[PDB]
Design a protein around this ligand. Structure first.
Ligand SMILES: Cn1ncc(C(=O)O)c1-c1ccccc1
Length: 126
């Protein structure tokens, strides 16, 4: 079902959360080789998550589930904000701009924390 498909999508998002927090520790410790690998892993987790969320939104639309479509449109929009900040973080790492990396890291944390009440709403709505 679309609801179980969302819980799977939710688990992929939580894998990205776990890897992200590990990466943040590696950044603080100056272990740039670990960071590089974790950023590659995160990119793959975010790409997967994004595609899964699109399939869920499209299914909700086909089912005529207006409330779930509304919430998923809002949630996917916020997802794109996090993704843009993530991509900027990756660029800051490439460029060796630790100040920008710290900034973007904190911004990505706040954007993700804000989107959580909506994330739980969607589970109930599907
Ligand atoms: C509860 N829930 N349902 C979907 C998601 C997601 O990130 O897709 C989440 C979520 C997971 C970790 C942090 C914030 C939201």
């Amino acid at each position: 079902s679309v609801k179980s498909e969302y819980a799977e999508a939710a688990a992929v998002g939580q894998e990205a959360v776990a890897v992200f927090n590990t990466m943040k520790a590696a950044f603080q410790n100056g272990d740039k080789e670990a960071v590089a690998q974790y950023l590659a892993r995160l990119a793959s987790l975010y790409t997967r998550h994004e595609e899964l969320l699109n399939r869920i939104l499209e299914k909700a639309r086909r089912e005529g589930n207006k409330e779930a479509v509304t919430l998923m449109n809002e949630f996917t929009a916020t997802f794109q904000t996090g993704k843009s900040i993530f991509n900027a973080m990756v660029a800051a790492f490439k460029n060796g701009d630790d100040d920008s990396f710290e900034s973007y890291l904190q911004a990505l944390e706040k954007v993700t924390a804000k989107g959580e009440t909506l994330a739980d709403q969607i589970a109930k709505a599907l």
